[PDB]
Amino acid sequence: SLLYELNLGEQSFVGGGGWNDLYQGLMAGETLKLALMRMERVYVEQNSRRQEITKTISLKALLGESWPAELNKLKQKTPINFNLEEQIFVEDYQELY
Amino acid sequence: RQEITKTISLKALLGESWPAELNKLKQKTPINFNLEEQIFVEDYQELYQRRIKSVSVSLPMLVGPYEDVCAQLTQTSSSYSTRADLKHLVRSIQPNQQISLSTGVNDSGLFMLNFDDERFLPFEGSGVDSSWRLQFTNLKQNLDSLNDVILHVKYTAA
Amino acid sequence: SLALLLGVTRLAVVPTNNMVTFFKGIANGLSENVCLTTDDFQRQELEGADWWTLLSTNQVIDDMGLVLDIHPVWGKSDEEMLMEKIQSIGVSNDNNTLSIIVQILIQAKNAQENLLSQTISAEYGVERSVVPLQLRWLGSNVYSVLNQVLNNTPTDISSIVPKLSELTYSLLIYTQLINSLKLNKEFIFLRLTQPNWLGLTQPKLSTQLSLPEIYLITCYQDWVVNANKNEDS
């Protein structure tokens, strides 16, 4: 959830295999506290306001009048099919990384 | 501390010669600012100290709900790493923050937040001695009907 | 025992693959989240190392200049020498950007030393305060041992470098030199710092030992007990 919710590359804090079979799992919990400490500090640094943007589109404005005409099939027979390609979502607006 | 609220019009700030000169600044350049004392302090009751809390913008232009006000505001900024002695990226976010418009009304100046957050608001804890920019960006490809720009400020005096 | 300790008609030992399990144990202990700054540790222009790229808002110059390593000296060694060495090499920025990168480095030096001093103590039965001094007085360096991981020592072929396989053999004889008689680290620290000042001859800066030392260091180790006052006077 940390790496998805901040959209981040790998750091691998929670390593498997911490159990012990000479000493029947002794100390196999105190490592999880230090895993959470190593993890938490990524959130202490890597939170800030990213460039929040709001957008809207009309299908008539997107597709043009030939598609509201072709819609006389798509009313009954099929779904309507889309993809937010750059010529309306990005190139018509300020650029981004 | 002495919490104060303020507003200004660029037509009222600069005078009619700048809304005339704007026939260049529509396309070629940003518009360049500094909140100097003769409008921010000398036109108001005096103070020993001054620190910002919030800001926002409204845009007197002939734009409807069905269209996008893609302009930009900035305070002079850096994202750069300090190097001692011994013997940036494609419109990315500088850590000082730079607000991008959408509506052309004060909700283009801040989003969602009322009076609290986990984190400092735009320019919060700064003095007012800075310099600022307005830039239209891709809005300059349909800019045809702008008339004035309105700014709003929250700050504490002492 | 005395002939063995003097290195005449020396011991024989088998390079059992258990040694690889121990050196792979060091490599594992180095690799599991210790995240050590040992990445091309000493040599000049220390370029391309992760740690100061993250902290670059506080200081950029990860390459530094001349070397980042230490030789012990009596009375006071410690991080003040590591600070003075990096301060001497032409940094004109004498402000906090120089001092902060010392207090960032202290735990990163500990993270190189603490591995050997905590682990080999459980192999050979010596206190963690003796280990780095025993290692140098035997004729070794902590990084030189750690570099054998980079020389593929953790590979379970039945062969390893003499720099380990004879060092490990030599460690057992020098372990008997510190258990057939018992002595405290300050003696070793003086002996390692300044042999001619202690009272030896110049050739005994080398690892070699002979009876003219063994008489004098033993009769010292009696006299330090026999004297009418405590340790330090």
Contact C120, C131 (CB under 8 A): yes
A96, β-bridge pairs: none
Chain A residues with CB under 8 Å of C32 CB are 15
Chain C nearest C-alpha distance from A88 (Å): 37
Residues of B with CB under 8 A from a CB of C: 81-87
Q: How far, in Å, are C158, C169, C172, C173 from residue C12 at the CA level?
A: 17, 9, 12, 12
- Give the CA distances from residue B40 to residues B36, B50, B77, C178, in Å, rounded to whole numbers and listed in that order: 6, 11, 22, 79
Classify the C-alpha dihedral C188-C190-C194-C199 as positive or negative: negative
Give me C88's structure tokens: 């001497």
Close Cβ partners of C12 (under 8 Å, ≥ 6 residues apart): none
What is the least distance, in Å, from the CA of B123 to any CA of chain A? 13
Closest CA to C170 of C194, C144, C212, C136: C136
Residues on chain C bordering chain A, Cβ-to-Cβ distance under 8 angstroms? 32-33
- Cα angle, residue C110 at apex, residues C141 and A17 outer, rounded to 5°: 100
Closest CA to C37 of C27, C23, C49: C49
- Burial of B108: CB neighbours in 10 Å, binned 0-12, 13-18, 19+: buried
Sequence-distant (6+) residues with CB within 8 A of C224 are C231
- Coil, helix or strand for A2? helix
Cα-based angle C90, C95, C101 (whole degrees, multiple of 5): 80
Residue C53 has φ and ψ, to the nearest 5°, of -70, -40
Q: Which residues of B45-62 are buried (b: 16+ CB within 10 A; e: fewer)?
A: eeeeebebbbbbbbbebe
- Nearest neighbour of C90 by CB, restricted to B81, B82, B87: B87
Q: How many CB atoms neighbour CB C38 within 10 A?
A: 20
Q: How many helices (H) and strands (E) does chain C have?
A: 12, 0
Angle between helices C211-226 and C185-193 (to 10 degrees): 140
Question: Which three-class secondary structure state does DSSP give residue C119?
Answer: helix
Number of H helices, E strands in chain B: 3, 6
Q: Identify whether the C-beta of residue C81 lies closer than 8 Å to the C-beta of residue C70.
A: yes
Which residues on chain C are in Cβ contact (under 8 Å) with B85?
90-93
Query: Chain C residue with minimal CA distance to A35?
Result: C33
What does the alpha-carbon distance between residue C64 and residue C67 come to, in Å, rounded to a whole number?
8
Q: Which of B80, B81, B88, B94 would best serve as a mutation to test chain C binding (most C beta carbons within 10 A)?
A: B81
User: In 3D, which of C114, C116, C94, C95 has the Cα closest to residue C106?
Assistant: C114
CB B104 within 8 A of CB B61: yes
Q: Return all residues near B56 (Cβ < 8 A) that are at least 6 apart.
A: B106, B107, B108, B109, B110, B151, B152
Q: Alpha-carbon distance B73 to C203, whole Å?
A: 75
The answer to whether C56 contacts B81, with C-beta atoms less than 8 Å apart, is yes
Strands B31-34 and B150-157: unpaired
Partner residue opposite B95 with nearest CB, options A48, A51, A96: A48
- What is the gyration radius of the CA atoms in chain C, in angstroms? 21
Three-state DSSP class for B91? coil
Q: Could you give the 3-state DSSP secondary structure of residue C208?
A: coil
Size of interface A-B (CB pairs under 8 A): 36
Q: What is the dihedral of CA C83, C89, C91, C95, to 10 degrees?
A: 20
Q: Show me where chain B is broken: residue before each gap, C-N > 2.5 A.
A: 87
CA distance A73 to B113: 45
φ and ψ at C92, to 5 degrees? -90, -20
Residue C113 φ then ψ, to 5°: -75, -45
Joined together, the tokens standing for residue C49 give 């190392």
Question: Looking up tokens 């009304």, which residue turns up?
Answer: B105
* Min Cα separation B79/chain C (Å): 9
Cβ neighbourhood burial of B123 (10 Å; 0-12, 13-18, 19+): buried
- Technique behind this structure? cryo-EM
